[PDB]
């Protein structure tokens, strides 16, 4: 019953091929490419150990049944949107998912269609079929007809919903970091893990999440295949570099979601404490006009000066994903700013 969320892409147009696998039509269907995936089953170390078990180092998952909700980049603000859910429980189907989540081998249409959970797959499009019927008036059949008879509208409408789901491989290596760590882990979190797990990271931007990934310094091992990150050309090479990445099937894949939460908690403990001190004094200083600008530009230096910030980010950088074996240590942002500026501004 292990549930997977999979961000897919195709070397061709995605919405075209996708709708063409929701009608069981052997006209247009292209290899699905799963480079991003989150697996879950219905404390912090209990969560780490549960995930490290599912994201088996061997490869693929550990559960015997899998419900994969294949998703595209769109808005249901959600960053991805479910397209077709598929239940692989049969031995062969579980075997092909494992070598597509662990090596990056394209999941052929016939396996996408054989496992199609039509009951819940068309439930996502049930409202879409109704609205298209009503609009054009002025189950699988619902779409087979709407597309065969009214293709442009369905394509453009499945293009308005599921917005910008057709981006190219350079787009991914540009917005999801040039590094392999980013390309795997940040794509997993920002798209398929942020909103589901909730927490503060649901409201953080892509650049912020990439910065958090940059400070997630889990021991890097020289890529075995020496595959260049820049060499990646098609969604075939992005997916390969990602699925066989050391950051995708084990401890790092299990520690990243917890580390996002930890880093934010430590940072806000300091940012919020110091914003309270800046807000008490901004409101109760009664100081000179030039001296007010001097104070506020001094307050924010003491709180966010590049050296102080560098020390703080080096104090939250990890060297291991296990929360009970983490190398992160207490940050000296707040304590020092209060012991070097705030008590002396409390000399009011």
């Amino acid at each position: 019953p292990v549930e997977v969320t999979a961000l897919y892409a195709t070397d061709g147009c995605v919405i075209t091929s996708s709708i063409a696998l929701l009608t069981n039509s052997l006209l247009g269907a292209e290899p699905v490419y799963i480079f991003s995936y989150d697996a879950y089953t219905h404390t912090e170390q209990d969560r780490f150990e549960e995930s490290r078990a599912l994201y088996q180092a061997s490869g693929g998952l550990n559960g015997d049944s899998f419900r994969v909700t294949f998703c595209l980049l769109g808005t249901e603000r959600g960053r991805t949107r479910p397209m077709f859910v598929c239940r692989f429980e049969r031995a062969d189907d579980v075997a092909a998912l494992q070598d597509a989540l662990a090596h990056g081998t394209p999941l052929q249409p016939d396996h996408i269609a054989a496992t199609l959970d039509a009951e819940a797959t068309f439930a996502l499009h049930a409202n879409m079929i109704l609205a298209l019927t009503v609009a054009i008036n002025n189950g699988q059949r619902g779409l087979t007809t709407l597309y065969v008879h009214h293709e442009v509208r369905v394509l453009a409408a499945y293009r308005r919903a599921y917005y910008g789901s057709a981006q190219s491989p350079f787009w991914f290596l540009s917005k999801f970091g040039p590094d392999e760590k980013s390309l795997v882990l940040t794509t997993r979190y920002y798209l398929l893990q942020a909103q589901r797990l909730g927490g503060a990271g649901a409201t953080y931007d892509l650049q912020a999440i990439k910065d958090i990934c940059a400070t997630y310094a889990i021991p890097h091992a020289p890529r075995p295949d020496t595959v260049s990150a820049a060499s990646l050309t098609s969604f075939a090479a992005i997916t390969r570099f990602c699925c066989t990445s050391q950051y995708a099937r084990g401890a790092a894949a299990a520690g990243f979601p917890l580390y996002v939460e930890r880093r934010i908690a430590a940072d806000v403990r300091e940012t919020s404490a110091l914003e309270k001190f800046i807000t008490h004094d901004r409101s109760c200083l009664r100081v000179s006009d030039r001296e007010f600008i001097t104070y506020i530009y001094l307050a924010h230096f003491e709180c966010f000066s590049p050296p102080r910030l560098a020390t703080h980010l080096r104090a939250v950088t990890t060297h291991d994903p296990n929360p009970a074996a983490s190398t992160e240590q207490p940050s000296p942002l707040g304590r020092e700013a209060v012991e070097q500026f705030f008590c002396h501004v409390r000399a009011q």
């Binding site: 001097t294 530009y297 001094l298 230096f301 000066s305 500026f341 002396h344």
Partner: protein, 128 residues
Amino acid sequence: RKASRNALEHFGRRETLTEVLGRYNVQTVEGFASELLGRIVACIETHFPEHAGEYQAVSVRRAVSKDDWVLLQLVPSLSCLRFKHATARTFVALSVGANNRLCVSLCQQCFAAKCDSNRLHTLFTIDA
């Protein structure tokens, strides 16, 4: 104070006027002014040639002496170089600018209202 100590550590030291002038053998300001007075009068000829010849024989008398500003007059009533109103007094002003380099500014204080009554107005600033 905390602003000044923190600015000295992030941006750099801006050397005082006296130290910068010491590089050009000035321990004597009214003599350095004389040597660059030629550059000053050359820029006057190039951009203000209609009043250039009033600046052929000029004596430099100190006006303001600070640790960041040195204003020095040029009595030989000279003419305003901005408008065409015997209405202005000329003042050479030396400060440290850019990468600790000496900026020599010709400034004129006129009396006519078009020019703020007896207020310093700069006209050109060159290096030394």
